[PDB]
Amino acid sequence: DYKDDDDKLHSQANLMRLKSDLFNRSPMYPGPTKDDPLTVTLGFTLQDIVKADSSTNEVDLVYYEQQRWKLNSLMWDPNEYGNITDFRTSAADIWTPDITAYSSTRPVQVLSPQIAVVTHDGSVMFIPAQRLSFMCDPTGVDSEEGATCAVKFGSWVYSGFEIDLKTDTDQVDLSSYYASSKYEILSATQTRQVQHYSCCPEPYIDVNLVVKFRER
Amino acid sequence: KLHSQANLMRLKSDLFNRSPMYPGPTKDDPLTVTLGFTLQDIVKADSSTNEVDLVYYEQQRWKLNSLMWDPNEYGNITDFRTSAADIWTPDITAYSSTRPVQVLSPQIAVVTHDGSVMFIPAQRLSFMCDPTGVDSEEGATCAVKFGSWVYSGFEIDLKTDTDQVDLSSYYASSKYEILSATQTRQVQHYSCCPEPYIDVNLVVKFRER
Amino acid sequence: DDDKLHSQANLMRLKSDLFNRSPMYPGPTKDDPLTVTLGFTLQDIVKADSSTNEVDLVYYEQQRWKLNSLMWDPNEYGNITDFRTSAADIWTPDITAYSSTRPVQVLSPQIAVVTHDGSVMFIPAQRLSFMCDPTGVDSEEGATCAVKFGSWVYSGFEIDLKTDTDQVDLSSYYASSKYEILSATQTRQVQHYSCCPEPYIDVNLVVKFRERR
Amino acid sequence: DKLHSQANLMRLKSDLFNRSYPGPTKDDPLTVTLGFTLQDIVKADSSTNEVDLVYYEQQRWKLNSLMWDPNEYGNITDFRTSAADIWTPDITAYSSTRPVQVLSPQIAVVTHDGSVMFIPAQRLSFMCDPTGVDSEEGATCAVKFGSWVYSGFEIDLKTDTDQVDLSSYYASSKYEILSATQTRQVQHYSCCPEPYIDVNLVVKFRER
Amino acid sequence: KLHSQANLMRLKSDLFNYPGPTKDDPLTVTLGFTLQDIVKADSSTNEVDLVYYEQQRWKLNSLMWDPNEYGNITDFRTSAADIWTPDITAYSSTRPVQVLSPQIAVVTHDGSVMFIPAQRLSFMCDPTGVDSEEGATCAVKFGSWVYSGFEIDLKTDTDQVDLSSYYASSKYEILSATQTRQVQHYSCCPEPYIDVNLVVKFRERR
Ligand SMILES: *[C@@H]1O[C@H](CO)[C@@H](O[C@@H]2O[C@H](CO)[C@@H](O[C@@H]3O[C@H](CO)[C@@H](O)[C@H](O[C@H]4O[C@H](CO)[C@@H](O)[C@H](O)[C@@H]4O)[C@@H]3O)[C@H](O)[C@H]2NC(C)=O)[C@H](O)[C@H]1NC(C)=O
Ligand SMILES: CC1=NCCC[C@]12CCCCC21OCCO1
Ligand SMILES: CC1=NCCC[C@]12CCCCC21OCCO1
Ligand SMILES: CC1=NCCC[C@]12CCCCC21OCCO1
Ligand SMILES: CC1=NCCC[C@]12CCCCC21OCCO1
Ligand SMILES: CC1=NCCC[C@]12CCCCC21OCCO1
Ligand SMILES: *[C@@H]1O[C@H](CO)[C@@H](O)[C@H](O)[C@H]1NC(C)=O
Ligand SMILES: [Cl-]
Ligand SMILES: [Cl-]
Ligand SMILES: [Cl-]
Ligand SMILES: [Cl-]
Ligand SMILES: [Cl-]
């Protein structure tokens, strides 16, 4: 009826007003600082090992990387905006962490839309699907124990004073792993690491993705 | 002609400036997107990586109240063509691609006076597919799901007009002949999330010509 | 040299009155349809892949159309009869290969020539991969392949196509190509498709070629 | 002084770019000088008759709209600026088989007399039959460079020499250069009543 | 926490509203290479592919600020598009550089900037002898494309390439890697030209 039509128009005007009040009325987040540090939660869902190149020692993964963080500057009261509890927005509208593979051999290829979900408590969920080429000797992939390769993910420019990383579990999600991949996964772990490098006194944080796989 | 041109420029200005823009679907304002595939070619089947490359055009249809107009107010313009950047479009994504989709057609949609939008992107898609059996009579079978990347069934529903893939543009001298191609709406509940997720499952059975 | 400053001022004034002081052309309509003339100049068959049935062409595609909204009196603009402009400053037709297997690679600058009668000429050079079975390319008869070109989104009621000639221009064809051209035609076609109710117009590029020996 | 030098350059660029060019015309034609420095023949593909060159292409022209009095801007005689800030000529290979790959920053040098020097490094794949490359006499291939959209009436081309600069050619290339010339040509095509100008790059090379 | 954000936002605003170096306002760029991998060596085309991160440091008076005026903020991370960056270019690449890291730099209160682009580079290299004891040697020069030694000086902190992150299971082992400032007076141009010459000696793992 007209009431239902009015409620939909109101829901749209409420969303437009909330996104306006966060992005127009408030200047985009400048990123974390030693005084305002930020924990990014990382999680990997490994979908496929596409290729293992023994001629270059490069391996190609397809996965989706779940990133979660929380900003005060993104909080709102659902009761002020028609009980809007969350919204979808272009990743370009918000700050996103510079989470980078430390040993890629090619630019990451993005396989999913650059859109995130923002929740009223100011939490952000961003799940980019990627194809990655990284440094990996596949020697042993034709063996019972298979090959093992590792790649570290972390901020490229922020130390542990500004950006901390967390995992919810050290088990890579394999529940979406392609059943007819050329490679079967023997194990996949994601482990937070704290490193002190010689360059700099600040500790650095990464999540180490370790994959054990063999030819099916 | 100059009147017709003025009427279309007025219509586009009314819809894109003078009306507030649509912010995407919500739980309170859900959207149904109709998907259909027209399969043009299986270009390549890589048994070294279990990747298959398809070329198709994907018809996407949806309807917004904010894109409606009365043709009698605009010299009986009943539709127009517009850049996809001008309007909201659904984030329809292959779930098991191995490479970024390559777009083969212009980013232009058709808007009709009832507020319905038709967008027909042609794509080259690399996806996870074991072609084992392609050189046999039974051929190989591969599947890829398509759906919203970021919207659940509470904001975007999917439908097909038919579960038969359109094979009317399938390349007659392809390396691969199609034994069957179906497109089937599926509802799934993942462990992560309590709300339902919707996809369309493209299932292709094919063999060497 | 003073005149040169006036000539530049005139062209800048012309461009400004055409682009800055008007809303960009919204494209053709059923009431105001547009005829685009196409011609292909085939430069090279670079590659014929028998493993995927894809062939790679290099050509430049001449596009010509005419808009009243681009007309000017040369007398009001220091007798300027035409100008070069970025393809981003003007509407251009969405002429698309029907059966490409990869995005077209653009080999020439995105610049067109606008003439005082409102006529535009745009000549994009392209490398195109398209669906083609090269079986018989190593035979006397050679191989035959075809690819249609037309608006992706506009039917025959909004965009009509014509050619000046049904013969592809082979005058620039690379003499030391791996493939020699037996024939190349470009032919207007009016067709109805399963996707859409109204007729669409294309130019069918048909190429018969064989290994150079 | 240094603070004043920055202020002067910023004001000059502001005056040249923000205060004040639509490209050349019949009434205001432009001469572009081209020179090639051939760095490497990377690859010769006898399956497709494509050859890949790496070179830098020196482009020079002079605009009245870019000249200034150095005395009026702290004796600044030249400056570097992004190529996007200025008009640049649409010099195009006539017979490329792939889009040119740009290897150098899109930055030009502008001088107080309004002269501009832009030196893009490029990897180019072009139409070339390398038959004979494995012989003493080697292979010969040629590629024309010129404006895509401007006839000889708007853009004239010049070379300083017909000799391609080989002083930077890669000494351990798979291919040695026997000769490399760059020749201005005036061409009439059946399409067009205006003459068109190109520089014909001709390279004779063999397997080392 | 809200005060720290406010202060950082204010600083960025004040700083961001540089035309590059000049003879009168010259710049020094410090370069250091951290070689991660020789991915492949192509003897059919004499191209080699390196993966490394290139540390770039320079200092501008215009980027200096007093920390006490901005709540003890000693530095900030910013998009490379917000600031001037030097046009450091490989002189003998055969393909455009592929950028493997985010275009973000660190700006410090003294006006210093550190930018560390990770890159994959294809460059001119004959790998002949890579399968011998002596290995193969290749070199590539890095410098400003458009600025002379009058506007941009280049230097290295050390002539030893950092090999401490070199991939242990690379197809190629490094026998030595050096990064050496060179001054060259070309014929065309009376002013000195500065590059850093990256020289890598490598051989197949046995
Ligand atoms: C846009 O579309 C609208 C709606 O289709 C259209 O309005 C319609 O115009 C037609 C023609 O003027 C109208 O048709 C008339 O209907 C009346 C009954 O109401 C008839 O009696 C008329 O018949 C006489 O006139 C005919 C010629 O006009 C003769 O051939 C005939 O023998 C009779 O003498 C006639 O059929 C119609 O009523 C309207 N409809 C509405 C809803 O108003 C409009 O013209 C179109 N164009 C534009 C720019 O808007
Ligand atoms: C995160 C990062 N950023 C820039 C340089 C490279 C790297 C990553 C590889 C190890 C060193 C490093 O530096 C500091 C800590 O980690
Ligand atoms: C559509 C989507 N978006 C983000 C995570 C991955 C994925 C797609 C693969 C299966 C799970 C999934 O999650 C919820 C619905 O489907
Ligand atoms: C040009 C075009 N536009 C949109 C869908 C696909 C296509 C091209 C392939 C055949 C059908 C078609 O539809 C109508 C005309 O031709
Ligand atoms: C320079 C140029 N521009 C547009 C198409 C191709 C070409 C060059 C090959 C011959 C025809 C041509 O067209 C006009 C005159 O020259
Ligand atoms: C840095 C540079 N810029 C433009 C042309 C090429 C190059 C680099 C290769 C050697 C010569 C050179 O020219 C002058 C000094 O250095
Ligand atoms: C253009 O040419 C015509 C005829 O040759 C002449 O009358 C006129 O003065 C010229 N200039 C202008 C500004 O119209
Ligand atoms: Cl944000
Ligand atoms: Cl919309
Ligand atoms: Cl236009
Ligand atoms: Cl200019
Ligand atoms: Cl700066």
Residue numbers in the entry:
A (entry chain C): -8 to 207
B (entry chain B): -1 to 207
C (entry chain A): -4 to 208
D (entry chain E): -2 to 17, 20 to 207
E (entry chain D): -1 to 15, 20 to 208
Relevant lines from the article:
The soluble ACh-binding proteins (AChBP) from mollusks form homopentameric assemblies of subunits homologous to the N-terminal, extracellular ligand binding domain (LBD) of the nAChR. The binding pocket of AChBP possesses all of the functional residues identified in the nAChR LBD, and its extension toward various directions of the interface provides multiple means for selective accommodation of the nicotinic ligands. This pocket is partially sheltered from the solvent by loop C, which is found at the outer perimeter of the pentamer and harbors at its tip a disulfide bridge linking the vicinal Cys190 and Cys191 residues, linked into a Cys-trans-Cys disulfide bridge (aka oxidized cysteinyl-cysteinyl ring), a signature determinant for nAChR α subunits.
Despite the moderate binding affinities, the well-defined electron densities revealed full ligand occupancy at all five binding sites due to the high protein concentration (ca. 100-fold the Kd values) and slight molar excess of spiroimine over A-AChBP used for complex formation and crystallization (see Experimental procedures). Such a drastic shift in the position of the 3-ring system for the two enantiomers is associated with differences in the loop-C position (and see below) and may account for the slightly (ca. 2-fold) higher affinity of enantiomer (+)-4 R for the two AChBPs compared to enantiomer (−)-4 S. The smaller mean score for the interaction of enantiomer (+)-4 R at all five A-AChBP subunit interfaces compared to that for enantiomer (−)-4 S suggests tighter binding to A-AChBP, independently of the loop-C conformation.
